[PDB]
Amino acid sequence: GMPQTAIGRQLVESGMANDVTLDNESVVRDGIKLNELAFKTFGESQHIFVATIDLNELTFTPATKDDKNVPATGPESSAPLPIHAFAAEANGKTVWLGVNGDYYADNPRRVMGLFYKDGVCINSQYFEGHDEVLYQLKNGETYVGQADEALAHEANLLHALGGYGLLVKDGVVQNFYEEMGDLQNTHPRTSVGLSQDRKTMYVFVVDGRRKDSFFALGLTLPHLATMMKAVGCYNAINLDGGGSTTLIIRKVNDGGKPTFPILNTPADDRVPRKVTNSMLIIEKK
Ligand SMILES: [Cl-]
């Protein structure tokens, strides 16, 4: 019976998943597969989504609440993930999938990692330790790496979305999280990685804090990293987690208008958190 999908088999083979009770897969659209699973990780219940995106067919962009390419200005700058999708859509993008983005500091509200969008620097002054990045060059090539590597491309850097925690590096699971404090405990997680050829993107949304009938605890970073390598990530990074972790997909309603339902269970007692940046999978134009 279980597991029944390739990803389910990969996660069980990795040692990070047992007692699989849900293992479903669907096609969001051509070029985007979505897998939803429930299982135990060393005795603790979990509930995760893994999206596999064909980067020959689709691309990504970092997103803000209003699709404007300027730093956050205040509380108005944060909104639940669907708002980011709607604003991108209203500004000529066709959005198919989204997750929350990078870590933010407060007082004043400001992004902690590197943040570039459409060739415009939103932040180049990444905080201590906030070194991880998913980036794209103007030539269309996508990479996962370190902030200085992205910056070294100068005016050829198109997009950059920051993270905190390098999970997989050149096919080897990483475990150098010791400066990250309580982020090392189990948590909901959002993470992103690339295949070795950089033509496939993997997005994980790991629910946590047992806010629905799955009783999903959440994961440590070595466990998540191990799962990501298992499904094909050669390079992978941890984005903002906890109550920030949110997944949307496009739903085309009769009449043609899109909505952007949230598929996971937000860990702030089921209430979608207002987030200041995000990662959207969009059509190539
Ligand atoms: Cl900012």
Side-chain angles (χ1 to χ4, degrees):
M2 298 292 236
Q4 56 204 1
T5 67
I7 281 175
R9 292 190 292 271
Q10 289 161 358
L11 296 174
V12 173
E13 189 186 37
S14 79
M16 301 299 105
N18 304 100
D19 297 344
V20 177
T21 55
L22 178 76
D23 184 11
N24 290 341
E25 66 189 345
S26 60
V27 174
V28 171
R29 58 149 280 166
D30 186 75
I32 307 174
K33 307 188 213 182
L34 185 61
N35 282 250
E36 186 187 349
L37 306 98
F39 52 73
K40 287 177 177 190
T41 296
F42 296 100
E44 300 287 356
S45 295
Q46 304 296 340
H47 176 226
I48 85 169
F49 297 85
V50 180
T52 307
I53 295 121
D54 179 344
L55 302 177
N56 290 314
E57 298 292 331
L58 294 151
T59 192
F60 83 98
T61 181
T64 57
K65 166 203 86 160
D66 54 18
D67 202 26
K68 299 173 193 187
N69 296 335
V70 296
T73 60
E76 66 278 15
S77 302
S78 297
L81 185 57
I83 300 303
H84 297 228
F86 282 121
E89 191 83 17
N91 200 39
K93 306 160 162 75
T94 301
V95 178
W96 283 93
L97 183 145
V99 296
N100 64 292
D102 196 1
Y103 293 79
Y104 277 72
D106 294 298
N107 307 125
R109 189 72 177 178
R110 63 205 188 282
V111 70
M112 298 182 77
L114 211 71
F115 188 15
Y116 278 65
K117 181 177 168 303
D118 305 320
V120 180
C121 174
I122 300 179
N123 188 38
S124 68
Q125 304 300 111
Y126 52 93
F127 285 50
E128 177 72 19
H130 285 259
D131 292 354
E132 278 63 60
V133 67
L134 166 66
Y135 63 107
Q136 190 175 91
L137 308 181
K138 283 183 182 171
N139 71 1
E141 296 293 334
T142 301
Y143 301 88
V144 169
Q146 299 295 292
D148 292 344
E149 293 161 356
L151 287 172
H153 289 278
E154 308 252 58
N156 290 332
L157 180 59
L158 182 70
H159 297 317
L161 180 62
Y164 188 35
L166 182 60
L167 299 171
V168 182
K169 176 184 185 22
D170 296 331
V172 180
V173 168
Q174 297 302 286
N175 178 33
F176 301 103
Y177 310 117
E178 65 282 355
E179 299 306 318
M180 301 181 53
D182 285 344
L183 290 179
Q184 303 173 87
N185 296 326
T186 59
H187 289 291
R189 310 289 190 178
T190 301
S191 60
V192 60
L194 293 173
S195 62
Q196 184 173 5
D197 68 7
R198 304 176 297 95
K199 300 306 197 284
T200 306
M201 175 186 290
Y202 301 95
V203 183
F204 277 62
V205 168
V206 173
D207 269 349
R209 310 185 184 158
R210 311 186 194 274
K211 303 299 179 180
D212 67 23
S213 60
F214 290 104
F215 289 81
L217 178 57
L219 293 177
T220 70
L221 295 171
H223 300 169
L224 172 61
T226 303
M227 291 183 193
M228 294 185 86
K229 188 195 162 153
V231 305
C233 294
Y234 195 65
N235 286 291
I237 62 168
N238 187 49
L239 305 182
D240 192 20
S244 301
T245 287
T246 318
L247 177 61
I248 56 166
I249 62 164
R250 185 193 199 80
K251 167 168 190 52
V252 178
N253 297 279
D254 287 3
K257 296 180 172 169
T259 51
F260 298 103
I262 292 173
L263 298 183
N264 72 308
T265 302
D268 293 343
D269 294 340
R270 310 176 68 111
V271 180
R273 180 181 285 186
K274 292 166 149 45
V275 300
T276 316
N277 83 3
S278 59
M279 208 272 278
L280 302 181
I281 300 299
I282 64 170
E283 296 188 7
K284 295 184 173 190
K285 276 164 187 205

